[PDB]
Amino acid sequence: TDANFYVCPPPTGATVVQFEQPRRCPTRPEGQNYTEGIAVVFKENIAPYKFKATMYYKDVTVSQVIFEDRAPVPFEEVIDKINAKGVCRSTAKYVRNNLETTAFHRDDHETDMELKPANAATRTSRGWHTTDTTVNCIVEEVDARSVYPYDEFVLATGDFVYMSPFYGYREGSHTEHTSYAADRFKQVDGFYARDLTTKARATAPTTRNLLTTPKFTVAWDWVPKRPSVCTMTKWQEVDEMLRSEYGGSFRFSSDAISTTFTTNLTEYPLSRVDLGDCIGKDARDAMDRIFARRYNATHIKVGQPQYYLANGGFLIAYQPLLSNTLAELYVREHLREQSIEFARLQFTYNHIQRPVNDMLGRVAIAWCEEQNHELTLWNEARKLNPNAIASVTVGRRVSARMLGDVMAVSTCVPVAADNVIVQNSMRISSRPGACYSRPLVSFRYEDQGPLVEGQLGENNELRLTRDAIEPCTVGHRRYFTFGGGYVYFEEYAYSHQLSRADITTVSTFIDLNITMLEDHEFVPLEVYTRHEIKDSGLLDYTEVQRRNQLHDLRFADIDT
Amino acid sequence: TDANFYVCPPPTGATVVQFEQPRRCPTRPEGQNYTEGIAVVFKENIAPYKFKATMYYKDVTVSQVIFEDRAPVPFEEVIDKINAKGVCRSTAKYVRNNLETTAFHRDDHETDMELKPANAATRTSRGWHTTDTTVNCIVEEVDARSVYPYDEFVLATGDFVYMSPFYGYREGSHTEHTSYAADRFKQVDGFYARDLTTKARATAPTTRNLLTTPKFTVAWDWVPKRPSVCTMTKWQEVDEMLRSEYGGSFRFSSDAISTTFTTNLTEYPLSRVDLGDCIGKDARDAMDRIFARRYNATHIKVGQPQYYLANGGFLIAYQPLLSNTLAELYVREHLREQSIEFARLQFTYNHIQRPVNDMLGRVAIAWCEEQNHELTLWNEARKLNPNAIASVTVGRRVSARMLGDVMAVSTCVPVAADNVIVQNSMRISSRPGACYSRPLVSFRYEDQGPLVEGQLGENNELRLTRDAIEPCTVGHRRYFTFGGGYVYFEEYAYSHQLSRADITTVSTFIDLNITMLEDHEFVPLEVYTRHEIKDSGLLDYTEVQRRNQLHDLRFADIDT
Amino acid sequence: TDANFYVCPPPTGATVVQFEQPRRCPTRPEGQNYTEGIAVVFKENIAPYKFKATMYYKDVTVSQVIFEDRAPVPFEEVIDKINAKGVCRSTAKYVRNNLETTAFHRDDHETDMELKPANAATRTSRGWHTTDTTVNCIVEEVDARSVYPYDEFVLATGDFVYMSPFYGYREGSHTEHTSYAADRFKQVDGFYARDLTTKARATAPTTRNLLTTPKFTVAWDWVPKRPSVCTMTKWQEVDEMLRSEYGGSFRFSSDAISTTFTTNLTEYPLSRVDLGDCIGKDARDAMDRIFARRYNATHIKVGQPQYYLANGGFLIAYQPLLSNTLAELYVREHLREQSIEFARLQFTYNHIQRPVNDMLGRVAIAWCEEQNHELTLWNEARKLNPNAIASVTVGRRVSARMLGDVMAVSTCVPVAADNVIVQNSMRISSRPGACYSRPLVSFRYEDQGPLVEGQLGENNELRLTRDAIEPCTVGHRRYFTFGGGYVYFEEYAYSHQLSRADITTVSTFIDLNITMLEDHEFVPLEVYTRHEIKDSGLLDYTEVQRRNQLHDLRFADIDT
Ligand SMILES: *[C@@H]1O[C@H](CO)[C@@H](O[C@@H]2O[C@H](CO)[C@@H](O[C@@H]3O[C@H](CO)[C@@H](O)[C@H](O)[C@@H]3O)[C@H](O)[C@H]2NC(C)=O)[C@H](O)[C@H]1NC(C)=O
Ligand SMILES: *[C@@H]1O[C@H](CO)[C@@H](O[C@@H]2O[C@H](CO)[C@@H](O[C@@H]3O[C@H](CO)[C@@H](O)[C@H](O)[C@@H]3O)[C@H](O)[C@H]2NC(C)=O)[C@H](O)[C@H]1NC(C)=O
Ligand SMILES: *[C@@H]1O[C@H](CO)[C@@H](O[C@@H]2O[C@H](CO)[C@@H](O[C@@H]3O[C@H](CO)[C@@H](O)[C@H](O)[C@@H]3O)[C@H](O)[C@H]2NC(C)=O)[C@H](O)[C@H]1NC(C)=O
Ligand SMILES: *[C@@H]1O[C@H](CO)[C@@H](O[C@@H]2O[C@H](CO)[C@@H](O)[C@H](O)[C@H]2NC(C)=O)[C@H](O)[C@H]1NC(C)=O
Ligand SMILES: *[C@@H]1O[C@H](CO)[C@@H](O[C@@H]2O[C@H](CO)[C@@H](O)[C@H](O)[C@H]2NC(C)=O)[C@H](O)[C@H]1NC(C)=O
Ligand SMILES: *[C@@H]1O[C@H](CO)[C@@H](O[C@@H]2O[C@H](CO)[C@@H](O)[C@H](O)[C@H]2NC(C)=O)[C@H](O)[C@H]1NC(C)=O
Ligand SMILES: *[C@@H]1O[C@H](CO)[C@@H](O)[C@H](O)[C@H]1NC(C)=O
Ligand SMILES: *[C@@H]1O[C@H](CO)[C@@H](O)[C@H](O)[C@H]1NC(C)=O
Ligand SMILES: *[C@@H]1O[C@H](CO)[C@@H](O)[C@H](O)[C@H]1NC(C)=O
Ligand SMILES: *[C@@H]1O[C@H](CO)[C@@H](O)[C@H](O)[C@H]1NC(C)=O
Ligand SMILES: *[C@@H]1O[C@H](CO)[C@@H](O)[C@H](O)[C@H]1NC(C)=O
Ligand SMILES: *[C@@H]1O[C@H](CO)[C@@H](O)[C@H](O)[C@H]1NC(C)=O
């Protein structure tokens, strides 16, 4: 059996994800009123609303040998030519020198041209384009996403739209906010959509909205109004959380959070809002689940739960707990003063609270110390190879690229191994002494689909563009992941495909039973005569850090 | 005292070692019939057979100012000239334009030439070479390795040999398979070997085999037949393993394995083969050892052990166990129905099995989550610096290079610190403003041995070739590991050698007691006038990621 | 709220810090006489003595279009012109061709020139310089540090000084050692210092020392003699340490140390020195603190503490302990022979000591195995980004650079976010198609202070020099850390500043609730016509490892 491949596309920044940074742990435990317990953090309900928003634009170019730009298609053309006729107007209007200018298709006259589907055959959208002055009409049914405010939504392209998806005049929808002018937006009642490939017309009426941006036009199905939802939502059911009071503000820490929260020491009156039932039941049910898992036989509940707001918009519901052994000290001191009511009794005995404040302090410091050890290492790994870190962070293969100091994310298309073919000879004849460093592959997004060219990337990753090249040396021996097994390549030529069991595997951290032997460097004689380069595998950190050094000397010689 | 140095050679791919990749953990525990226990995984006995196979070949070159290649030496020359005379024939035959062609030694006539030992003085072999058209006869007693099938063996060079080492006609050895023609192989009965350095002849008869490959000739001692061995062997004595039944197949997971196994839910009848005693006793003894270590006072054995096959060829022997506290629930329910026979009683009570299925599920998910955290980080570290990861993975200093998506391995030669000398002036006078970035060293593989030139690498690593150079700046201050201590170098000049105790050490993860002060940049005045570059130490990830950016701009200027 | 920025300067090597390297763990536990306990390691008291040592030097340069060098200012000039007049002599003496040579200021005659403060406005010192042949007199009140020997001290610049700070003839100070000649050093009794900015003279007498080095002159306040101190000091209060006897030497290992110690098996007679009380009380108090924390209810003290010396100069105080359950076996065997005196009774029963020797062996091996896992990873992270590792290792933001195989350290200046301004347009008009890859910033070291130019670095780091540039592409979208939040930049133009809560955060290790969608690559049409480059974010390890490959091919074409 072979695993499914993945063709990760470059993210455009539609989804942005910052990654936690190391905090500042206390060198010595100085907190007060330490106490353990079960906590359930909640993240603000962003209310992600998704809809396939269709984008329309015209690309104008000149074959003179200039001044190419993207202009938006008008509303009448979309509803008359593209919609009622499935064609795009050959002529287009673009701004130049602060004056409207007209363009044509290959220096021709106005003629109806149909919209053909995209050749990429990707799942993003059909991406209808007419041509694979020179005007080109392109239509794409890309995806879009909105947030809880609903005043602005972002398209798959990443360009923020300053118009609410529910804006319109058909009904009393979100007509309270709009950045673009009235003429820049138009709503059609009783509109009918259709597929440009079949042109079978919509089965039922579907009102369509239209917005003309400075660079493109967008349209989508106009829904009257999405119903309300909880304003608060669960984020993580922490198994154990320690509360620390210091500087007039609590300090919450946990092992499976890697982030510390700060409150105002006052319980937030969650009951003042009607959402208390939606979150109260959800939060209360979580306490019993975690408490009944392992704390029912070793801890006692300290009063009722408590809710506190945290910096950044996080809502935390706490449930203080104390070990059974610690209860013996509290009850013993309680009986002394009298000569089980743990509520309002915690922190009463300073001497009993003195050791626990220090004992739990090391635990909090230990978690902070180890958490920073992983955070400082995880961040570097993300920068080194965000794709690998992205996949292990979202439970599935996902693309990602570093947009400076913020992480980007985009979905990867899975394709079965039966729809991919690897080129036998990876060597390229267009340039001797230089060829692709990885095997070339051909594949189809689906069974019987069109064939496309590409390159095989690391970890069964497929790259649309073939650019991984290097100065191909002699005596090259390498292996590349291909489905459930590897593919053996020697001297830049397909030798044979070997399964996963044909290569020794060091699963455990330490494995001294390897049958390794003393290797003898069999340097080919051609390198000693033709003064060429010999294979060295992928560059080591010291090697890559050394290869650039040689380059630095090359520019000095050229400059001198 | 000083530690021993290491001169790691570049691996040729003789030994290949894939490294585990992150698995896919379940977001929620959906397994059924959870149970802990002691497990002992077994790896298929590869039966590594090693033998010093002698390689013979002739390198032909032309001094015209072409068409150089490696040809194999015939059998008569090896047994008559090299063996019975310790010399190599000056003339050689090589193929050119699909026609046999003859060559000579420095445009001379046929003359007997002796074989002199190699100047490298490495432990791989003597590597006898005659010369340090132009033909050159070279003989090397390199090492070789075979696998359980024994039909094909691999030499230290890495070139696979499609001839079984036991092939021959002297006796009923492995004569059932052979890829090369009969004329390409020859066996000599009662053959006598000898050392080309002493030429004292073998002490006893030693039948020698001979194979002529398209690029070289190989010979080795012909052993009649290695005796049989166990077909199964131990790989790891897991302290704790959790079995999970899901989708009609078990799922084995452990903390010290980092890999999940899949079975068919049926116990493999290991007793059907005679090897059951060899593995049964070995496996049974391991259960008592681990059980008697920590599980004898907190767990009870659930029936007899069970053996199951796993994907990839791994054999796993399980021993289900249950905590003593959990036994109280089973016995309590057992007595209820009656109104210690844990065997065939597990999973009978669904309500009792409901919480354990979820409790143990988090443990399995926790191990999978943390295992992926290390796997995704370990893989990047291996790619960054495979030498460091290779040494910590095989318990000893070992070389390694990335052969694409598979790890290579080769042995490193240890040399005492008393046989190495460091050059005082690392600066090179052949080119101003550019010199070696690391100190140069001279050493001998053994006491009183020949002296060779080399460069000092990271972590007491010795490199045969001196290539680590960079644009030597001004005001350079650096330290390099040298034996048990460091060597101080300032302005590219040996200052003095300081022990390990002369430099502050931050052993603990966090150390705030450092006596660090505010450093003042003492930029030399020469840089402000001679517009040269100033020292900056080894490049940071952002610096190296920034240095290439400057290079990218340099090519644009050159191209423009 | 916004966090404080940090401008880390390049360390000059004044403080050097080696970092622990992976040890060699035993494949199988072979130690003898295993035992747990509380340990407190001690590091030799280095006795760091700090003093603001003022450096004086004259920079001579020639405007011919040579032979520029740094010379030391004489003693009379410092005490007469700089001290009694706050000016520097225009003329200076420098060596050339082994002959004294005179220089002038801009080819002028001798004239008094005052010393103006530095324009950097750094906390290192005022750095008075006269000019912002051509001679320039510069005075800097840099910091200095000394070690326990006190014979040599190091300045902030990093140049070691071979003269004791207490050297002199005014009293019986450290006059027993001096490397420089008598004429090279001079001490002034009853000297008076002053501030060159105010010139208000010292309030009280302050004897000043003066030393003339081959490249500069240094002066500082001469203290008679620092009082004595403890010769030993605490380093870490280990919670648990395991002692292993093997090869006639003990082997100490702990989880929070990551380093193994070796002794001579004999208790060091600490009582022979008067420091036993200073360290005995300090060490004894630590045992009770750790013992009373968690070992008072589960372990029993085995005799009195024991002190042993360790390789490298570390003093370790041990306190053997044994679990309560293990005591039942010792007392049981003790009563058998008789037919609580644990002291001198440990290791008496070989059979009872056989399992513990193996059980504790795995713990020691487990710690060594996991410790090497972090050490081998921590070292690579330090090399990758020493600044991040430096900050998390010293509890505060600190600079660091790799000086070969030794880590450098220097303090970073914190500045409030209210004293920094970010440039709106990061693009540079001096060169199209190439600009700064990070936003440019302007700031002042303090409120109302002078404004300086700089660049914004990663993790709120400020760089004095603006050099982070790259071939600016089209359709660039990136985020940069700015105070408590991020700054959004699109197409190399300041768009707006968004808080930390405006970007999704993946705090937990695995977060599958992201609202990620399928991104559609919106490639600008200008790239398809103007054949320019498209944005790709920060380079991935495979990308950077691939970018250099393209460069390698560029030099081949140029060379060919
Ligand atoms: C802890 O309590 C303090 C004090 O109440 C909280 O700060 C306060 O936050 C409120 C909003 O929650 C601020 O009110 C608003 O402030 C500005 C004008 O100052 C404006 O947006 C509105 O007109 C309104 O008045 C209030 O100013 C602010 N007070 C102070 C002194 O900063 C704080 O947020 C609480 N912390 C947590 C974690 O809940
Ligand atoms: C779990 O059980 C299944 C079903 O028995 C195993 O798959 C079976 O594996 C056997 C060999 O072990 C296959 O037999 C051979 O298959 C091909 C022809 O199909 C050929 O090599 C031989 O002539 C022989 O018949 C059998 O086809 C295959 N069955 C299926 C349905 O795939 C499977 O390996 C077991 N898994 C484990 C982990 O033990
Ligand atoms: C364990 O014990 C051995 C043996 O006593 C220690 O080695 C010895 O260390 C002393 C100094 O502590 C050495 O004495 C000095 O040696 C040289 C001349 O050899 C010179 O500096 C002085 O004149 C003085 O004699 C002694 O030679 C040395 N002995 C041996 C055999 O090496 C060792 O240091 C102890 N280990 C620990 C960890 O305490
Ligand atoms: C720890 O908790 C105790 C118990 O609530 C706090 O002690 C009370 O503090 C309030 C003022 O905050 C006083 O009016 C009460 O008399 C105190 N005692 C009791 C029994 O309530 C204590 O202040 C808390 N610690 C800190 C640092 O605030
Ligand atoms: C978990 O184990 C139990 C006990 O073996 C399984 O329950 C039996 O299932 C078989 C069929 O596989 C039935 O014939 C038996 O009657 C069941 N009960 C007993 C007491 O044997 C159960 O199927 C297992 N779980 C899964 C998911 O297969
Ligand atoms: C482990 O400790 C025991 C107890 O001290 C050592 O046994 C003693 O060894 C000395 C010599 O070193 C003998 O004179 C004693 O007779 C032994 N027994 C006792 C009760 O003291 C033992 O040698 C230690 N292990 C090792 C490897 O040295
Ligand atoms: C908690 O433990 C008590 C005491 O054994 C038991 O009666 C109760 O049912 C347990 N609760 C849960 C939810 O398991
Ligand atoms: C191979 O494994 C066995 C146990 O199966 C072990 O005893 C032996 O030492 C290992 N071989 C090497 C070379 O370490
Ligand atoms: C296991 O524990 C029992 C009960 O204490 C004891 O009798 C037995 O000897 C132990 N077995 C081993 C192998 O330690
Ligand atoms: C140095 O260590 C001591 C304990 O030995 C500690 O109290 C002190 O704070 C440390 N110094 C600094 C500057 O942190
Ligand atoms: C240690 O435990 C004993 C027994 O409970 C107790 O009497 C003693 O006070 C404890 N000592 C400390 C320092 O906590
Ligand atoms: C989002 O979180 C909820 C729990 O709050 C979980 O049930 C759901 O599966 C998550 N969504 C996805 C797409 O995984």
GROMACS .gro file of C-alpha atoms in nm, chain A residues 108-320:
model
  213
  108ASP     CA    1  -0.899   4.303  -3.294
  109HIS     CA    2  -1.253   4.443  -3.279
  110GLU     CA    3  -1.536   4.373  -3.035
  111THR     CA    4  -1.642   4.009  -3.059
  112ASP     CA    5  -1.810   3.768  -2.818
  113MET     CA    6  -1.562   3.526  -2.659
  114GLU     CA    7  -1.664   3.235  -2.437
  115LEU     CA    8  -1.509   3.155  -2.099
  116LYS     CA    9  -1.316   2.826  -2.092
  117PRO     CA   10  -1.230   2.644  -1.765
  118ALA     CA   11  -0.886   2.671  -1.609
  119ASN     CA   12  -0.608   2.433  -1.708
  120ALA     CA   13  -0.483   2.403  -1.349
  121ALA     CA   14  -0.785   2.187  -1.255
  122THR     CA   15  -0.749   2.287  -0.890
  123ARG     CA   16  -1.020   2.263  -0.624
  124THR     CA   17  -1.007   2.638  -0.549
  125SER     CA   18  -1.245   2.717  -0.836
  126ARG     CA   19  -1.300   2.659  -1.205
  127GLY     CA   20  -1.099   2.974  -1.278
  128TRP     CA   21  -1.256   3.034  -1.619
  129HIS     CA   22  -1.019   3.217  -1.854
  130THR     CA   23  -1.073   3.307  -2.219
  131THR     CA   24  -0.709   3.312  -2.340
  132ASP     CA   25  -0.453   3.066  -2.204
  133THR     CA   26  -0.335   4.539  -2.686
  134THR     CA   27  -0.423   4.195  -2.547
  135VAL     CA   28  -0.718   4.184  -2.306
  136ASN     CA   29  -0.805   3.866  -2.116
  137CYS     CA   30  -1.126   3.805  -1.920
  138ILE     CA   31  -1.091   3.570  -1.623
  139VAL     CA   32  -1.362   3.448  -1.383
  140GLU     CA   33  -1.285   3.252  -1.065
  141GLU     CA   34  -1.526   3.110  -0.806
  142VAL     CA   35  -1.273   3.142  -0.522
  143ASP     CA   36  -1.366   3.094  -0.156
  144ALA     CA   37  -1.412   3.368   0.103
  145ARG     CA   38  -1.432   3.397   0.481
  146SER     CA   39  -1.582   3.644   0.727
  147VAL     CA   40  -1.540   3.708   1.100
  148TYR     CA   41  -1.782   3.781   1.385
  149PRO     CA   42  -1.814   4.157   1.311
  150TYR     CA   43  -1.929   4.069   0.954
  151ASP     CA   44  -1.849   4.424   0.838
  152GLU     CA   45  -1.551   4.301   0.633
  153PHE     CA   46  -1.467   3.964   0.478
  154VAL     CA   47  -1.148   3.827   0.323
  155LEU     CA   48  -1.131   3.632  -0.003
  156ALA     CA   49  -0.906   3.335  -0.076
  157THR     CA   50  -0.673   3.574  -0.260
  158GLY     CA   51  -0.615   3.754   0.071
  159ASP     CA   52  -0.731   4.100  -0.038
  160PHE     CA   53  -0.958   4.230   0.237
  161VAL     CA   54  -1.305   4.339   0.125
  162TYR     CA   55  -1.448   4.641   0.309
  163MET     CA   56  -1.810   4.545   0.229
  164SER     CA   57  -2.023   4.325   0.452
  165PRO     CA   58  -2.142   4.006   0.276
  166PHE     CA   59  -2.497   4.074   0.400
  167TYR     CA   60  -2.504   4.431   0.268
  168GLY     CA   61  -2.793   4.517   0.038
  169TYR     CA   62  -3.129   4.687   0.005
  170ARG     CA   63  -3.354   4.388  -0.068
  171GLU     CA   64  -3.433   4.353   0.304
  172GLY     CA   65  -3.326   4.495   0.640
  173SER     CA   66  -2.985   4.326   0.628
  174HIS     CA   67  -2.648   4.467   0.739
  175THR     CA   68  -2.696   4.803   0.565
  176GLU     CA   69  -2.548   5.003   0.855
  177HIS     CA   70  -2.188   4.996   0.725
  178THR     CA   71  -2.025   5.025   0.383
  179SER     CA   72  -1.692   5.179   0.280
  180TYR     CA   73  -1.743   5.180  -0.097
  181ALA     CA   74  -1.979   5.420  -0.272
  182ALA     CA   75  -2.332   5.324  -0.370
  183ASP     CA   76  -2.241   5.316  -0.739
  184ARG     CA   77  -1.961   5.068  -0.662
  185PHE     CA   78  -2.215   4.810  -0.535
  186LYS     CA   79  -2.526   4.665  -0.697
  187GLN     CA   80  -2.774   4.396  -0.590
  188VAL     CA   81  -2.997   4.206  -0.834
  189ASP     CA   82  -3.323   4.057  -0.707
  190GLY     CA   83  -3.437   3.724  -0.845
  191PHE     CA   84  -3.103   3.677  -1.020
  192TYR     CA   85  -3.021   3.340  -1.177
  193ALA     CA   86  -2.672   3.190  -1.180
  194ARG     CA   87  -2.531   2.921  -1.408
  195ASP     CA   88  -2.223   2.714  -1.487
  196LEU     CA   89  -2.017   2.850  -1.776
  197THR     CA   90  -1.916   2.493  -1.868
  198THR     CA   91  -2.271   2.357  -1.905
  199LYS     CA   92  -2.475   2.681  -1.920
  200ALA     CA   93  -2.781   2.498  -1.784
  201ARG     CA   94  -2.902   2.798  -1.576
  202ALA     CA   95  -2.973   2.787  -1.203
  203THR     CA   96  -3.244   2.550  -1.083
  204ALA     CA   97  -3.399   2.805  -0.844
  205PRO     CA   98  -3.375   3.184  -0.801
  206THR     CA   99  -3.053   3.304  -0.637
  207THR     CA  100  -3.017   3.676  -0.568
  208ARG     CA  101  -2.662   3.786  -0.651
  209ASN     CA  102  -2.461   4.075  -0.510
  210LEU     CA  103  -2.197   4.267  -0.706
  211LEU     CA  104  -1.908   4.487  -0.591
  212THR     CA  105  -1.659   4.668  -0.816
  213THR     CA  106  -1.317   4.715  -0.655
  214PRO     CA  107  -1.035   4.930  -0.796
  215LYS     CA  108  -0.865   4.611  -0.926
  216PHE     CA  109  -1.145   4.355  -0.968
  217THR     CA  110  -1.516   4.275  -0.937
  218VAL     CA  111  -1.665   4.024  -0.692
  219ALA     CA  112  -2.006   3.855  -0.674
  220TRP     CA  113  -2.161   3.602  -0.439
  221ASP     CA  114  -2.490   3.457  -0.320
  222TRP     CA  115  -2.670   3.709  -0.099
  223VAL     CA  116  -2.806   3.538   0.214
  224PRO     CA  117  -3.056   3.754   0.412
  225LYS     CA  118  -2.897   3.718   0.757
  226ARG     CA  119  -2.719   3.441   0.944
  227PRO     CA  120  -2.887   3.356   1.278
  228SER     CA  121  -2.726   3.444   1.608
  229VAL     CA  122  -2.483   3.204   1.789
  230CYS     CA  123  -2.305   3.167   2.132
  231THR     CA  124  -2.063   3.469   2.176
  232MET     CA  125  -1.822   3.242   2.365
  233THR     CA  126  -1.675   2.903   2.271
  234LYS     CA  127  -1.451   2.636   2.423
  235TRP     CA  128  -1.082   2.625   2.334
  236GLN     CA  129  -0.913   2.369   2.561
  237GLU     CA  130  -1.003   2.151   2.861
  238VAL     CA  131  -0.689   2.190   3.072
  239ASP     CA  132  -0.623   1.890   3.294
  240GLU     CA  133  -0.449   2.097   3.564
  241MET     CA  134  -0.403   2.472   3.610
  242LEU     CA  135  -0.227   2.661   3.890
  243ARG     CA  136  -0.345   3.006   3.999
  244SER     CA  137  -0.093   3.254   4.140
  245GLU     CA  138  -0.182   3.587   4.300
  246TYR     CA  139   0.089   3.851   4.259
  247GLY     CA  140   0.092   4.226   4.208
  248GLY     CA  141  -0.283   4.259   4.253
  249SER     CA  142  -0.352   4.022   3.963
  250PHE     CA  143  -0.380   3.646   3.927
  251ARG     CA  144  -0.136   3.442   3.718
  252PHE     CA  145  -0.273   3.125   3.555
  253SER     CA  146  -0.028   2.864   3.427
  254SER     CA  147  -0.064   2.514   3.286
  255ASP     CA  148   0.154   2.248   3.126
  256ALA     CA  149  -0.053   2.205   2.807
  257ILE     CA  150  -0.105   2.579   2.738
  258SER     CA  151   0.243   2.735   2.721
  259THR     CA  152   0.089   3.078   2.790
  260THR     CA  153   0.018   3.267   3.112
  261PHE     CA  154  -0.301   3.467   3.174
  262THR     CA  155  -0.366   3.774   3.390
  263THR     CA  156  -0.694   3.876   3.555
  264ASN     CA  157  -0.827   4.150   3.786
  265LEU     CA  158  -0.878   3.924   4.095
  266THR     CA  159  -1.258   3.973   4.070
  267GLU     CA  160  -1.500   3.711   3.941
  268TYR     CA  161  -1.662   3.828   3.620
  269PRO     CA  162  -2.044   3.837   3.659
  270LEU     CA  163  -2.112   3.593   3.375
  271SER     CA  164  -2.476   3.567   3.490
  272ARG     CA  165  -2.541   3.926   3.376
  273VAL     CA  166  -2.562   3.803   3.014
  274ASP     CA  167  -2.801   3.546   2.870
  275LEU     CA  168  -2.498   3.353   2.739
  276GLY     CA  169  -2.428   3.229   3.093
  277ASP     CA  170  -2.645   2.924   3.029
  278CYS     CA  171  -2.471   2.845   2.699
  279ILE     CA  172  -2.126   2.871   2.860
  280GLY     CA  173  -2.221   2.776   3.217
  281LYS     CA  174  -2.352   2.434   3.119
  282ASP     CA  175  -2.067   2.380   2.874
  283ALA     CA  176  -1.810   2.488   3.133
  284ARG     CA  177  -1.971   2.301   3.423
  285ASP     CA  178  -1.994   1.980   3.221
  286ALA     CA  179  -1.621   2.003   3.148
  287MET     CA  180  -1.533   2.024   3.519
  288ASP     CA  181  -1.715   1.699   3.597
  289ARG     CA  182  -1.558   1.524   3.298
  290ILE     CA  183  -1.202   1.616   3.399
  291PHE     CA  184  -1.273   1.585   3.772
  292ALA     CA  185  -1.434   1.242   3.728
  293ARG     CA  186  -1.136   1.129   3.518
  294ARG     CA  187  -0.855   1.145   3.777
  295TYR     CA  188  -0.931   1.405   4.049
  296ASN     CA  189  -1.238   1.229   4.192
  297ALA     CA  190  -1.021   0.993   4.401
  298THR     CA  191  -0.742   1.234   4.507
  299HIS     CA  192  -0.888   1.587   4.531
  300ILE     CA  193  -1.185   1.770   4.683
  301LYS     CA  194  -1.377   2.053   4.519
  302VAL     CA  195  -1.319   2.393   4.682
  303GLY     CA  196  -1.655   2.566   4.650
  304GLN     CA  197  -1.829   2.642   4.324
  305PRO     CA  198  -1.653   2.733   3.997
  306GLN     CA  199  -1.528   3.085   3.929
  307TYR     CA  200  -1.508   3.282   3.604
  308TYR     CA  201  -1.249   3.551   3.530
  309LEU     CA  202  -1.163   3.751   3.220
  310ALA     CA  203  -0.809   3.742   3.084
  311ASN     CA  204  -0.592   3.973   2.877
  312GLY     CA  205  -0.639   3.918   2.504
  313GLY     CA  206  -1.008   3.827   2.520
  314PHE     CA  207  -0.983   3.481   2.678
  315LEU     CA  208  -1.247   3.371   2.930
  316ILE     CA  209  -1.128   3.123   3.194
  317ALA     CA  210  -1.350   2.917   3.424
  318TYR     CA  211  -1.161   2.790   3.730
  319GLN     CA  212  -1.239   2.524   3.990
  320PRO     CA  213  -0.992   2.534   4.282
   0.00000   0.00000   0.00000
